[PDB]
Coordinates of C-alpha atoms and ligand atoms in Angstrom, one line a residue:
Chain V
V2 CA 0.0 0.0 0.0
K3 CA 1.2 3.6 -0.6
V4 CA 0.7 6.3 1.9
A5 CA 1.4 10.0 1.9
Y6 CA 1.7 13.3 3.8
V7 CA 0.8 16.7 2.5
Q8 CA 3.0 19.3 4.2
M9 CA 1.4 22.7 3.5
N10 CA 1.4 26.2 4.8
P11 CA -2.2 27.1 5.9
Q12 CA -3.1 30.8 5.5
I13 CA -4.8 31.8 8.7
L14 CA -8.5 32.6 8.2
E15 CA -8.4 31.9 4.4
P16 CA -10.1 28.5 4.0
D17 CA -10.7 29.0 0.2
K18 CA -7.0 29.5 -0.4
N19 CA -6.2 26.5 1.8
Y20 CA -8.7 24.3 -0.1
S21 CA -7.0 25.3 -3.4
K22 CA -3.6 24.5 -1.9
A23 CA -4.7 21.2 -0.4
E24 CA -6.4 20.1 -3.7
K25 CA -3.1 20.8 -5.6
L26 CA -1.0 18.7 -3.2
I27 CA -3.5 15.9 -2.8
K28 CA -3.6 15.5 -6.6
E29 CA 0.2 15.3 -6.6
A30 CA 0.2 12.6 -3.9
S31 CA -2.5 10.7 -5.9
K32 CA -0.3 10.9 -9.1
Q33 CA 2.6 9.4 -7.1
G34 CA 0.3 6.5 -6.3
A35 CA -0.8 7.3 -2.7
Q36 CA -4.0 5.6 -1.5
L37 CA -4.1 7.4 1.8
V38 CA -3.2 11.1 2.1
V39 CA -2.8 12.9 5.4
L40 CA -3.0 16.7 5.8
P41 CA -1.9 18.9 8.7
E42 CA -3.9 19.9 11.8
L43 CA -6.3 22.8 11.2
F44 CA -5.3 22.9 7.5
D45 CA -8.4 25.0 6.6
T46 CA -8.4 27.7 9.3
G47 CA -4.7 27.9 10.5
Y48 CA -3.7 27.8 14.1
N49 CA -2.4 31.0 15.8
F50 CA -5.7 32.7 16.7
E51 CA -5.9 35.8 18.8
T52 CA -9.5 35.2 19.8
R53 CA -11.8 32.2 19.7
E54 CA -14.2 34.5 17.7
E55 CA -12.1 34.7 14.6
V56 CA -12.0 30.9 14.2
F57 CA -15.6 30.2 15.4
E58 CA -16.8 32.6 12.7
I59 CA -15.4 30.5 9.9
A60 CA -15.3 26.9 11.4
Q61 CA -17.3 24.3 9.6
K62 CA -19.6 21.5 10.8
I63 CA -18.7 17.9 10.1
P64 CA -19.8 16.4 7.8
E65 CA -22.3 19.0 6.5
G66 CA -19.8 21.9 6.2
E67 CA -17.5 23.2 3.5
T68 CA -14.3 21.5 4.5
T69 CA -15.8 18.0 4.5
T70 CA -17.7 18.6 1.3
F71 CA -14.6 20.0 -0.4
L72 CA -12.5 17.0 0.7
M73 CA -15.3 14.6 -0.5
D74 CA -15.0 16.1 -4.0
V75 CA -11.2 15.8 -4.0
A76 CA -11.3 12.1 -2.7
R77 CA -13.9 11.2 -5.4
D78 CA -11.9 12.9 -8.2
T79 CA -8.5 11.4 -7.2
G80 CA -9.7 8.1 -5.7
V81 CA -7.8 8.5 -2.5
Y82 CA -8.7 8.4 1.2
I83 CA -7.9 11.6 3.1
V84 CA -7.4 12.3 6.7
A85 CA -7.2 16.1 7.3
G86 CA -7.2 18.4 10.3
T87 CA -10.1 20.9 10.5
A88 CA -11.7 23.3 13.0
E89 CA -15.0 21.6 13.7
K90 CA -18.1 23.6 14.7
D91 CA -20.6 21.7 16.7
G92 CA -23.3 24.1 17.9
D93 CA -21.7 26.5 20.2
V94 CA -18.5 24.5 20.6
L95 CA -15.4 24.0 18.6
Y96 CA -13.3 20.9 18.4
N97 CA -9.8 20.4 16.9
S98 CA -10.7 17.6 14.6
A99 CA -9.7 15.4 11.8
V100 CA -12.0 14.2 9.0
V101 CA -11.7 10.9 7.2
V102 CA -13.2 10.8 3.7
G103 CA -12.9 8.3 0.8
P104 CA -14.0 8.1 -2.8
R105 CA -17.6 7.2 -1.7
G106 CA -17.9 10.0 0.8
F107 CA -17.6 10.8 4.5
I108 CA -16.2 8.0 6.7
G109 CA -15.8 9.5 10.2
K110 CA -14.1 11.9 12.4
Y111 CA -11.7 12.2 15.4
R112 CA -11.6 15.0 18.0
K113 CA -8.2 15.9 19.5
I114 CA -8.1 14.4 23.0
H115 CA -5.0 16.2 24.3
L116 CA -5.1 20.0 23.6
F117 CA -1.9 21.9 23.4
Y118 CA -1.2 25.3 25.0
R119 CA -3.6 28.0 23.8
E120 CA -5.8 25.5 22.0
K121 CA -7.4 25.1 25.4
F122 CA -8.8 28.6 25.0
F123 CA -10.5 27.8 21.7
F124 CA -11.4 24.2 21.6
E125 CA -13.2 21.6 23.7
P126 CA -11.2 18.5 24.5
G127 CA -12.2 15.6 22.3
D128 CA -14.9 13.3 23.4
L129 CA -15.0 10.5 20.8
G130 CA -12.0 8.5 22.0
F131 CA -9.3 7.1 19.7
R132 CA -10.9 5.6 16.6
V133 CA -9.7 3.2 14.0
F134 CA -11.4 3.3 10.5
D135 CA -11.5 0.1 8.4
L136 CA -11.0 0.9 4.7
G137 CA -10.8 -2.8 3.8
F138 CA -7.4 -2.6 2.3
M139 CA -6.1 -1.1 5.5
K140 CA -7.2 0.1 8.9
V141 CA -6.3 3.7 9.7
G142 CA -6.1 5.1 13.2
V143 CA -6.1 8.9 13.7
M144 CA -4.5 11.1 16.3
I145 CA -3.7 14.8 16.1
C146 CA -0.5 16.9 16.8
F147 CA 0.2 16.8 20.6
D148 CA -1.5 13.5 20.9
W149 CA 1.9 12.1 19.9
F150 CA 3.3 13.2 23.3
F151 CA 1.2 10.7 25.2
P152 CA 2.3 7.1 24.3
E153 CA -1.3 6.0 25.2
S154 CA -2.7 7.7 22.1
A155 CA -0.7 5.6 19.6
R156 CA -1.0 2.5 21.8
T157 CA -4.8 2.8 21.9
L158 CA -5.0 3.1 18.1
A159 CA -2.6 0.1 17.6
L160 CA -4.6 -2.1 20.1
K161 CA -7.7 -1.3 18.1
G162 CA -6.0 -2.7 14.9
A163 CA -4.5 0.3 13.2
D164 CA -2.2 -0.6 10.3
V165 CA -1.2 3.0 10.0
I166 CA -1.6 6.0 12.3
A167 CA -2.6 9.1 10.3
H168 CA -1.3 12.1 12.3
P169 CA -2.2 15.6 11.2
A170 CA 0.1 17.9 13.2
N171 CA 1.1 21.6 13.7
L172 CA 4.3 21.1 15.5
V173 CA 6.1 23.9 17.4
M174 CA 8.6 21.8 19.4
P175 CA 11.4 19.8 17.8
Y176 CA 10.7 16.5 19.5
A177 CA 8.1 14.7 17.4
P178 CA 10.3 13.8 14.4
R179 CA 12.6 11.9 16.9
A180 CA 9.7 10.4 18.7
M181 CA 7.5 9.1 15.9
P182 CA 9.8 6.3 14.8
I183 CA 9.6 5.1 18.5
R184 CA 5.8 5.3 18.5
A185 CA 5.9 3.2 15.2
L186 CA 8.4 0.7 16.7
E187 CA 6.7 0.3 20.1
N188 CA 3.3 -0.5 18.4
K189 CA 4.6 -2.2 15.3
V190 CA 2.7 0.2 13.1
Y191 CA 3.4 2.7 10.4
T192 CA 2.9 6.4 11.2
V193 CA 2.3 9.3 8.8
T194 CA 2.8 12.7 10.4
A195 CA 1.6 15.5 8.1
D196 CA 3.0 18.7 9.7
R197 CA 2.4 22.2 8.5
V198 CA 5.1 24.7 7.8
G199 CA 5.2 28.5 7.9
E200 CA 5.4 31.5 10.2
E201 CA 2.0 32.6 11.4
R202 CA 1.6 35.8 13.5
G203 CA 5.1 35.3 14.9
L204 CA 4.9 31.5 15.5
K205 CA 7.1 29.3 13.4
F206 CA 6.1 25.7 12.7
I207 CA 8.5 22.8 12.5
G208 CA 7.7 21.2 9.2
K209 CA 9.6 17.8 9.1
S210 CA 6.6 15.7 8.2
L211 CA 7.6 12.0 8.2
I212 CA 6.5 8.5 7.5
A213 CA 8.0 5.9 10.0
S214 CA 8.1 2.2 9.8
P215 CA 7.5 -0.5 12.4
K216 CA 11.4 -0.9 12.4
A217 CA 11.8 2.8 13.5
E218 CA 13.1 3.6 10.0
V219 CA 12.2 7.0 8.5
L220 CA 10.8 6.1 5.0
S221 CA 10.2 9.8 4.0
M222 CA 10.9 13.1 5.7
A223 CA 10.2 16.6 4.6
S224 CA 12.0 19.9 4.9
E225 CA 11.4 22.4 7.7
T226 CA 9.9 25.2 5.6
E227 CA 8.7 24.0 2.1
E228 CA 5.3 22.7 1.0
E229 CA 5.7 19.1 -0.3
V230 CA 4.3 15.7 -0.6
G231 CA 6.0 12.6 0.7
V232 CA 5.0 9.1 -0.3
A233 CA 6.1 5.7 1.0
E234 CA 5.2 2.1 0.2
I235 CA 4.3 0.1 3.3
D236 CA 4.0 -3.6 4.1
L237 CA 0.9 -4.5 6.0
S238 CA 1.9 -8.0 6.9
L239 CA 4.7 -6.5 9.0
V240 CA 2.3 -4.5 11.2
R241 CA -0.4 -7.1 11.5
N242 CA 1.9 -9.8 12.9
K243 CA 2.9 -8.4 16.3
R244 CA 5.8 -10.8 16.7
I245 CA 9.1 -9.0 17.0
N246 CA 10.8 -12.4 17.2
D247 CA 9.5 -15.9 17.5
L248 CA 9.1 -15.8 21.3
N249 CA 7.7 -12.2 21.8
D250 CA 4.4 -10.9 20.4
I251 CA 4.2 -7.4 21.6
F252 CA 0.4 -7.3 22.3
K253 CA 0.3 -10.8 23.8
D254 CA 3.2 -9.7 26.1
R255 CA 1.5 -6.7 27.5
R256 CA 0.4 -7.3 31.1
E257 CA -2.2 -4.5 31.6
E258 CA -3.0 -5.2 35.2
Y259 CA 0.5 -3.8 36.2
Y260 CA 0.1 -0.6 34.2
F261 CA -0.5 2.8 35.9
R262 CA -0.8 1.3 39.5
Chain G
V2 CA 22.4 15.3 42.8
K3 CA 24.6 13.0 40.7
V4 CA 23.4 9.6 39.3
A5 CA 25.5 7.1 37.4
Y6 CA 25.5 3.9 35.3
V7 CA 28.1 1.1 35.6
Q8 CA 28.7 -0.5 32.2
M9 CA 30.4 -3.8 32.7
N10 CA 31.0 -7.2 31.1
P11 CA 29.5 -9.9 33.3
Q12 CA 31.4 -13.3 33.0
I13 CA 28.7 -15.9 32.6
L14 CA 28.3 -18.2 35.6
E15 CA 31.2 -16.5 37.5
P16 CA 29.6 -14.3 40.2
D17 CA 32.9 -13.9 42.2
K18 CA 34.5 -12.2 39.2
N19 CA 31.4 -10.1 38.6
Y20 CA 31.4 -8.9 42.2
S21 CA 35.0 -7.9 42.0
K22 CA 34.4 -6.0 38.7
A23 CA 31.2 -4.4 40.0
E24 CA 32.9 -3.2 43.2
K25 CA 35.8 -1.6 41.2
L26 CA 33.4 0.3 39.0
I27 CA 30.9 1.3 41.7
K28 CA 33.9 2.9 43.6
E29 CA 34.8 4.8 40.4
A30 CA 31.3 6.2 40.1
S31 CA 31.3 7.1 43.9
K32 CA 34.7 8.8 43.5
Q33 CA 33.1 11.0 40.8
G34 CA 30.3 12.0 43.3
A35 CA 27.5 9.7 42.2
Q36 CA 24.8 9.1 44.9
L37 CA 22.8 6.6 42.8
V38 CA 24.6 3.9 40.8
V39 CA 22.8 1.5 38.4
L40 CA 24.3 -1.8 37.3
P41 CA 23.2 -4.0 34.3
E42 CA 20.6 -6.7 34.2
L43 CA 21.9 -10.0 35.6
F44 CA 25.2 -8.5 36.4
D45 CA 26.1 -11.4 38.8
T46 CA 25.2 -14.4 36.6
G47 CA 25.4 -13.2 33.0
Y48 CA 22.6 -13.8 30.6
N49 CA 23.0 -16.2 27.7
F50 CA 22.0 -19.5 29.3
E51 CA 21.3 -22.7 27.6
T52 CA 19.8 -24.6 30.6
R53 CA 17.7 -23.4 33.5
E54 CA 20.0 -25.6 35.7
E55 CA 23.2 -23.8 35.1
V56 CA 21.6 -20.5 36.3
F57 CA 19.4 -22.1 39.0
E58 CA 22.4 -23.7 40.7
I59 CA 24.1 -20.3 41.3
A60 CA 21.1 -17.8 41.6
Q61 CA 20.9 -16.1 44.9
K62 CA 17.9 -15.4 47.2
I63 CA 16.9 -11.8 48.0
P64 CA 17.6 -10.4 50.4
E65 CA 19.6 -13.0 52.3
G66 CA 21.7 -14.3 49.4
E67 CA 25.2 -13.3 48.3
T68 CA 24.5 -10.7 45.7
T69 CA 22.4 -8.7 48.0
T70 CA 25.0 -9.1 50.7
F71 CA 27.7 -8.0 48.4
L72 CA 25.7 -5.0 47.2
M73 CA 24.9 -3.9 50.8
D74 CA 28.6 -4.1 51.7
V75 CA 29.7 -1.9 48.8
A76 CA 26.8 0.6 49.3
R77 CA 27.9 1.0 53.0
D78 CA 31.5 1.3 52.2
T79 CA 31.3 3.8 49.3
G80 CA 28.2 5.6 50.5
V81 CA 25.9 5.2 47.5
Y82 CA 22.5 3.7 46.7
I83 CA 22.7 0.9 44.2
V84 CA 20.2 -0.6 41.8
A85 CA 21.5 -3.8 40.2
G86 CA 20.2 -6.7 38.1
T87 CA 20.4 -10.1 39.6
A88 CA 19.0 -13.6 39.1
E89 CA 16.6 -14.1 42.0
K90 CA 16.0 -17.6 43.4
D91 CA 12.6 -18.0 45.2
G92 CA 12.0 -21.6 46.0
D93 CA 12.1 -23.6 42.8
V94 CA 11.4 -20.4 40.7
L95 CA 13.8 -17.8 39.3
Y96 CA 12.9 -14.2 38.6
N97 CA 14.9 -11.7 36.5
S98 CA 15.2 -9.1 39.2
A99 CA 16.8 -5.9 40.4
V100 CA 17.9 -5.2 44.0
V101 CA 17.9 -1.7 45.5
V102 CA 20.2 -1.1 48.5
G103 CA 21.5 2.0 50.2
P104 CA 24.3 2.6 52.7
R105 CA 22.0 1.5 55.6
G106 CA 20.8 -1.7 54.1
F107 CA 18.4 -3.5 51.7
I108 CA 15.6 -1.3 50.4
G109 CA 13.6 -3.5 48.0
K110 CA 13.4 -5.4 44.8
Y111 CA 11.7 -5.3 41.4
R112 CA 10.9 -8.4 39.2
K113 CA 11.0 -7.9 35.4
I114 CA 7.5 -7.7 34.1
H115 CA 8.1 -8.2 30.4
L116 CA 10.5 -11.1 29.8
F117 CA 12.5 -11.0 26.6
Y118 CA 13.1 -13.8 24.2
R119 CA 14.8 -16.9 25.8
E120 CA 14.4 -15.4 29.3
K121 CA 11.0 -17.0 29.0
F122 CA 12.7 -20.5 29.2
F123 CA 14.4 -19.6 32.5
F124 CA 12.5 -17.0 34.5
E125 CA 9.0 -16.5 35.8
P126 CA 7.3 -13.2 34.8
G127 CA 7.6 -10.7 37.6
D128 CA 4.7 -10.2 39.9
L129 CA 5.3 -7.0 42.0
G130 CA 4.4 -4.4 39.4
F131 CA 6.5 -1.3 38.8
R132 CA 7.8 0.0 42.2
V133 CA 9.1 3.4 43.1
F134 CA 11.5 3.5 46.1
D135 CA 11.5 6.6 48.3
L136 CA 15.0 7.4 49.4
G137 CA 13.8 10.6 51.1
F138 CA 16.0 12.9 49.0
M139 CA 14.7 11.4 45.8
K140 CA 12.4 8.7 44.5
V141 CA 13.8 6.0 42.2
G142 CA 11.7 3.9 39.9
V143 CA 13.1 0.6 38.6
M144 CA 12.5 -1.3 35.3
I145 CA 14.7 -3.8 33.5
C146 CA 15.9 -4.2 30.0
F147 CA 13.0 -5.0 27.6
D148 CA 10.6 -3.2 29.9
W149 CA 11.8 -0.1 28.0
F150 CA 9.9 -1.4 24.9
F151 CA 6.5 -1.0 26.5
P152 CA 5.9 2.7 27.2
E153 CA 3.6 1.6 30.1
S154 CA 6.6 0.6 32.2
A155 CA 8.2 4.0 32.4
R156 CA 4.8 5.7 32.6
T157 CA 3.8 3.6 35.6
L158 CA 7.0 4.6 37.4
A159 CA 6.8 8.3 36.5
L160 CA 3.1 8.4 37.7
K161 CA 4.3 7.2 41.0
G162 CA 6.7 10.1 41.4
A163 CA 9.9 8.6 40.2
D164 CA 12.6 11.4 39.9
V165 CA 14.8 8.9 38.1
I166 CA 14.1 5.6 36.5
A167 CA 17.0 3.2 37.2
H168 CA 17.2 0.8 34.2
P169 CA 19.5 -2.3 34.4
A170 CA 19.7 -3.6 30.8
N171 CA 21.4 -6.3 28.6
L172 CA 20.5 -4.9 25.2
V173 CA 20.8 -6.9 22.1
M174 CA 18.7 -4.7 19.7
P175 CA 19.9 -1.3 18.6
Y176 CA 16.7 0.6 19.5
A177 CA 16.8 1.4 23.2
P178 CA 19.5 4.1 23.1
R179 CA 17.3 6.1 20.6
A180 CA 14.1 5.4 22.6
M181 CA 15.2 6.2 26.1
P182 CA 15.4 9.9 25.6
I183 CA 11.7 9.8 24.4
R184 CA 10.8 7.7 27.5
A185 CA 12.5 10.5 29.6
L186 CA 10.7 13.3 27.7
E187 CA 7.2 11.8 27.6
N188 CA 7.3 11.3 31.4
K189 CA 9.5 14.4 32.2
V190 CA 11.8 12.1 34.2
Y191 CA 15.5 11.2 34.2
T192 CA 16.5 7.7 33.0
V193 CA 19.7 5.8 33.7
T194 CA 20.2 2.8 31.5
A195 CA 23.1 0.7 32.6
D196 CA 23.8 -1.7 29.8
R197 CA 26.4 -4.5 29.7
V198 CA 28.9 -5.0 27.0
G199 CA 30.7 -8.1 25.7
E200 CA 30.2 -11.3 23.7
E201 CA 28.7 -14.2 25.5
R202 CA 28.4 -17.6 23.7
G203 CA 28.4 -15.6 20.5
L204 CA 25.7 -13.0 21.5
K205 CA 27.0 -9.5 21.3
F206 CA 25.5 -6.8 23.6
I207 CA 25.1 -3.3 22.5
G208 CA 26.8 -1.3 25.3
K209 CA 25.7 2.4 24.9
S210 CA 24.6 2.9 28.5
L211 CA 23.1 6.3 28.8
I212 CA 21.6 8.9 31.0
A213 CA 18.6 10.8 29.5
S214 CA 17.0 14.0 30.7
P215 CA 13.3 15.2 30.9
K216 CA 14.2 17.3 27.8
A217 CA 15.3 14.3 25.8
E218 CA 18.9 15.3 26.1
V219 CA 21.6 12.6 26.5
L220 CA 23.7 13.7 29.4
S221 CA 26.1 10.7 29.2
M222 CA 26.5 7.8 26.8
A223 CA 28.9 4.9 26.9
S224 CA 30.9 3.0 24.3
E225 CA 29.7 0.0 22.5
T226 CA 32.3 -2.4 23.9
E227 CA 34.2 -1.0 26.9
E228 CA 33.6 -1.2 30.6
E229 CA 33.1 2.3 32.1
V230 CA 31.0 4.4 34.3
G231 CA 29.0 7.5 33.5
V232 CA 28.0 10.1 36.1
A233 CA 25.9 13.2 35.6
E234 CA 24.1 15.8 37.8
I235 CA 20.3 15.9 37.6
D236 CA 17.8 18.7 38.3
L237 CA 15.0 17.5 40.5
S238 CA 12.8 20.4 39.9
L239 CA 12.8 19.7 36.1
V240 CA 11.3 16.3 36.8
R241 CA 9.0 17.2 39.7
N242 CA 7.3 20.1 37.7
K243 CA 5.2 18.3 35.1
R244 CA 4.3 21.6 33.4
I245 CA 5.9 21.8 29.9
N246 CA 4.4 25.2 29.5
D247 CA 1.9 27.4 31.4
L248 CA -1.1 25.6 30.0
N249 CA 0.1 21.9 29.9
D250 CA 0.9 19.8 32.9
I251 CA 1.6 16.5 31.4
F252 CA 0.0 14.4 34.2
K253 CA -3.1 16.6 34.6
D254 CA -3.5 16.4 30.8
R255 CA -3.7 12.6 30.7
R256 CA -7.3 11.4 30.1
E257 CA -7.2 7.7 31.1
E258 CA -10.9 7.3 30.3
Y259 CA -10.0 7.3 26.6
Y260 CA -7.0 5.0 26.9
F261 CA -6.9 1.3 25.9
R262 CA -10.6 1.3 25.0
Ligands
LIG301 MG1 -0.1 33.1 19.6
LIG302 MG1 13.0 -16.2 49.7

């Protein structure tokens, strides 16, 4: 299976420009043969808000709203599955969400469980848990940005059968590119971290999107500042067999009753 | 306060030689100011057994047996606290254990929760959980070797207030030195991995003992092949403050209701 990140620079409060940009890069990933394409956190709205009001004003409902319907059209035209971060309006609340769409339409969503820094002023903590979406040819788990920091996020998706963890991100610390290969290794999964780039109202993002293997190899990694697509071929047998050798199966070896007490 | 690893080459089935070597190196760490000194997994017996008999016949009881006695003697003489891997005899059973002693006596033990590879032919899985020992001036968590692979091991110790995770290891895979700084970071704790070196019945150990900080810095890292000590100062306030910024306290931020389900 081929998987891809889109590393782009969202223009804050300019969703139509960001849709244009996303469509261009998703089409490039599709031409490269990607079947799953992951976009950054908050690709439609940007990130560095001064007030909750300027993001609430433009944030879209899922799946009725413009970001989801836009991505549905792109998935149908290119025949890929997309996981993309988006500001989700749900009544009077905002969630920091990721939408999953495929060529037949909307598949599901995930709401960021662990908010970072000023996101706590804008968004409600996610309340749908960590979900794994079965696409038939693969099962994709989704976590967003700072969720990487908690090993429990990736672990929960892997226990639920994720072959790949799709990871929209808007990184501001330099740690996640070092950590993602370890998250991939400790769960025996592939990870696709689609980070943004850019400077946005004085805040500089890290870039360095990457795809990591269950052997902690970096299969693709992006620049710090450029918009780009990265694609890697992945071997699903490697991640479905949780044996790391003939005497240790990492999930059968877990002894949950000793954890966190 | 200073903590240290001892990286040594246990001679299989020769505890007398291993005590002599350990004592030499513990004194070196103490001479450099270390207050806590961590030794490798199974430092007294070695590791690469072919029969359970050849280990069972020499394995010592805890705390009344010779390895604990030896460690108490050195701790008293050199004025340090020691965490050391040892084969533990308990009736007709062996555990792959670590002993914790200080200058005033035996403090406690830990039994490896996650057995690795052929250890399953020789040892019983541990049954005490992940323990944190309060030395008054600092709290020391213990895990052993392959426990590193499961993020839950280090997390359990850190949640119980470990300032430092003492980590006796006998590493054969290349991954742990890259992963330990991420274990230190994700728990905001210090880690001291005391690995062995050497070739033992054709099995080559990795060496690369290391001390990692709560900022994923590597404060000390040993060679691949040589016996050596490594000592570094640690900042207790850096581990005890779980805030990584004004809005994120990493333990307050955990949402266990969404983990593993
Ligand atoms: Mg700001
Ligand atoms: Mg006994």
